[PDB]
Amino acid sequence: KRQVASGRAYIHASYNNTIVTITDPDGNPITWSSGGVIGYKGSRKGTPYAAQLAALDAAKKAMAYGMQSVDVIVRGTGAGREQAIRALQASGLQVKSIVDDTPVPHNGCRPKKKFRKAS
Amino acid sequence: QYRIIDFKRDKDGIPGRVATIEYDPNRSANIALINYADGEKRYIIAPKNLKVGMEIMSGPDADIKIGNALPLENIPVGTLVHNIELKPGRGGQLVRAAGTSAQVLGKEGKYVIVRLASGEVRMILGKCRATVGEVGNGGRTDKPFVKAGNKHHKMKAPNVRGVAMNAVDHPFG
Amino acid sequence: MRRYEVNIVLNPNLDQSQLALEKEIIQRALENYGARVEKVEELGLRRLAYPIAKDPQGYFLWYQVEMPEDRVNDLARELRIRDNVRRVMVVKSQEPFLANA
Amino acid sequence: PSRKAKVKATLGEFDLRDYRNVEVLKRFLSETGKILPRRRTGLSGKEQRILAKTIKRARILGLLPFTEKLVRK
Amino acid sequence: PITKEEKQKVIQEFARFPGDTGSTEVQVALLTLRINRLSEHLKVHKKDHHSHRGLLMMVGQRRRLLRYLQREDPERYRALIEKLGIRG
RNA sequence: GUGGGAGAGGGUGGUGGAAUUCCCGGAGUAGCGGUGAAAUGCGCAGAUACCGGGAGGAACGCCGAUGGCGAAGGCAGCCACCUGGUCCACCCGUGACGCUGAGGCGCGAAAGCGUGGGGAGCAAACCGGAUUAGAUACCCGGGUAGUCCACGCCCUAAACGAUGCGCGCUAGGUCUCUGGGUCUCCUGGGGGCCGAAGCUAACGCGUUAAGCGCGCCGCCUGGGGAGUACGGCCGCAAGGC
Residues from chain D contacting residue C89 (CB–CB below 8 Å):
57, 60-61
| Chain C residue with Cα closest to D45 | C99
Q: How many domains does chain E have?
A: 1
CA distance C84 to chain B (A): 10
Q: Which helix (H) or strand (E) holds B89?
A: none
The CA distance from B72 to A44, in Å, is 59
Minimal Cα–Cα distance from D68 to chain A, Å? 9
DSSP E strand boundaries for C2-42? 2-10, 36-40
Instruction: Report the distance separating Cα B98 and Cα B114, nearest Å.
Output: 14
Query: Domain holding E70: CATH number?
Result: 1.10.287.10
CA–CA separation, C67 and C70 (whole Å): 9
Q: Which residues of C touch D53 (CB under 8 A)?
A: none
- Spatial distance between the Cα atoms of B17 and A61, rounded to a whole number of angstroms: 73
CA D35/CA D52 separation, integer angstroms = 8
Pinpoint the alpha helices (H) of A28-112: 48-64, 81-90
Q: Does B98 touch chain C (CB under 8 A)?
A: no
Residue E41, Cα to own-chain centre: how many angstroms? Answer: 16
Separation CA A98–CA A34 (nearest Å)? 19
What CATH number is associated with residue C7?
A: 3.30.70.60
Question: Is D69 within 8 Å of A98 when comparing Cβ atoms?
Answer: no
Dist. CA A79–CA A99, nearest whole Å: 18
CA distance E14 to A27: 77
Choose the mutation target among C5, C7, C45, C100 for the interface with D, i.e. most D CBs under 10 Å: C100
> What backbone phi and psi angles, to 5 degrees, belong to D29?
-80, -20
Half-sphere exposure of A110 (CA within 13 A, CB side): 3
Residue C47, beta-bridge partner list: C57
Tell me, rounded to whole angstroms, the distance of Cα A74 from its chain centroid.
7
Check if the beta carbon of residue E14 is closer than 8 Å to that of residue E26. yes
The residue type of B61 is D
Q: Would you tell me which residues 47-66 of chain B have a C-beta closer than 8 angstroms to some C-beta of chain C? A: 64
Question: Quick one: which of B135, B29, B125, B136 has its CA closest to B85?
Answer: B125
Q: Where are the alpha helices (DSSP H) in chain E?
A: 4-14, 24-43, 49-72, 74-84
B53 CA to centre of own chain: 21
H-helix or E-strand containing B21?
strand B16-24
Query: Which amino acid is present at B156?
Result: K
Give me the CATH topology for the region D1-73. Answer: 30s Ribosomal Protein S18 (4.10.640)
- CA-to-C1' span, E67 to F211 (A): 39
- Give, in order, the Cα–Cα distances in Å from A77 to each of A53, A119, E52: 17, 21, 52
Tell me the pairing of strands B102-108 and B80-82: antiparallel
Which residues in chain D touch residue C64, judged by CB atoms under 8 angstroms apart? Answer: none
Q: Where are the alpha helices (DSSP H) in chain A?
A: 48-64, 81-90
**Determination approach:** X-ray
The total number of structural domains in chain C stands at 1
Q: Which of D14, D63, D69 to mutate to test the interface with C (most CBs of C within 10 A)?
A: D63
Nearest nucleotide by C1' position to the B103 CA atom: F55
β-partners of residue A32 are A21
Ranges of each domain in chain A: 1-119
Q: Which amino acid is at A25?
A: P
CA distances from D21 to C47, C95, D27, D41, D63 (A): 15, 14, 9, 16, 9
CATH class assigned to A1-119: alpha beta
Q: What single-letter DSSP state applies at residue C53?
A: T
- CB–CB of D35/D28 below 8 Å? yes
Domain edges within chain D: 1-73
**CA A20, CA A58: separation in Å to the nearest integer?**
7
By CB atoms closer than 10 A (0-12, 13-18, 19+), residue C98 is exposed
Facing residues of A71 across strands?
Answer: A8, A97
CA-to-C1' distance for D38 and F55, Å? 40
Distance from residue A15's CA to nucleotide F32's C1', rounded to whole Å? 14
State the amino acid at position C67 in one-letter form: M
CB–CB contact C9 D9 (8 Å): no
